[model samples]
Target: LLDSYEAILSGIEETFAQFSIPYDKEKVREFIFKYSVQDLLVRVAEDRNLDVEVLNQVRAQSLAEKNAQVV
Candidate 1:
């Protein structure tokens, strides 16, 4: 859902803001393409000292969508 996706993006934004890091959509897209959402979240959380749960909720929704596509 749009809200789920929005939450994910917003969380990422907040994390970057909290760390005083700039957000780069293209760079993020690269990670998204190169890693699972879980892996990406791990990297982001570790790199930025972000909380994983913020991203986890969106990841769960994304995983569900992928599973639905396979069914």
Candidate 2:
């Protein structure tokens, strides 16, 4: 779902924010924005050498966090 993709992007943005990268945030945003939601997730995992399942779990957590804020 689109919500899941947003959550994944949130996690990625958060990770990048903590690292102090040289590029502007918009560049990072634009890069990720180029892919479809699920494709973006796969690309991220492959790029980072992380397992897709790990990202799934994080996506669930991110959705939960957003849900909690709404109530």
Candidate 3:
């Protein structure tokens, strides 16, 4: 969803504003690509509905993947 990108962009914007870092639109755009992909994948796992079902599924998958990578 476009909101996902918007949320990330907003977070980056906040960080930049707080830290006085330059607004690097290009860098945020690049991160959006990667993050959006993961977001979409989680969406698929949740049947494409932004509801509790999707949240639970994504939470499990994300944590599992993170632990796997760490190990």
Candidate 4:
């Protein structure tokens, strides 16, 4: 299983890559702090046989919001 921080960090990395946004350590740190909580929810989804699709989509939306902030 992937560690939550790594999972969230990689997602943010891809988000920055997608938007051609510069990756700033401070900004990345901020996103991790925020979304890592969702990562746990994602984990819970996995554990409980719950649909992570909804949870995953939520993360994607938040990622979009985060990019909008950085954009």
Write the residue-wise lDDT of candidate 4 on 1-71 in tens digits: 43555545556555444445455657566655676646654555676666656555545854534444221
lDDT per residue as tens, model 2, 13-67:
5443333423344654576668554565566678777766666665555443464
Sorted on TM-score, best first, the list reads 2, 1, 3, 4
- Itemize residue pairs with steric clashes in candidate 3: none
Residue-level lDDT of model 1, residues 3-57, one tens digit each, is 4543455455555555566767677657756775578767777887777786565
Top candidate when judged by TM-score against the true structure:
2
Query: What global local distance difference test value does model 1 have?
Result: 0.59
Segments in model 4 whose C-alpha atoms lie over 4 Å from true places: 34-71
lDDT of each: 0.59, 0.53, 0.47, 0.54
Tell me the alpha-carbon RMSD of every candidate.
7.2, 5.5, 15.0, 11.8
**All candidates: TM-score:** 0.45, 0.46, 0.37, 0.36
Question: How many residue pairs collide in each prediction?
Answer: 0, 0, 0, 0
Which pairs clash inside model 4? none
- Across residues 1-71, which tens digit of lDDT does each residue of candidate 3 receive? 33445544544444344334455768667755777635533543365344544334433443323333211
* Cα lDDT for residue 45, candidate 4: 60
Query: Highest lDDT among the candidates is held by which one?
Result: 1
- The regions of model 2 sitting more than 4 angstroms off are 1-11, 14-24, 63-71
TM-score of 4: 0.36
Give residue 20's lDDT in candidate 1 (0 to 100). 69
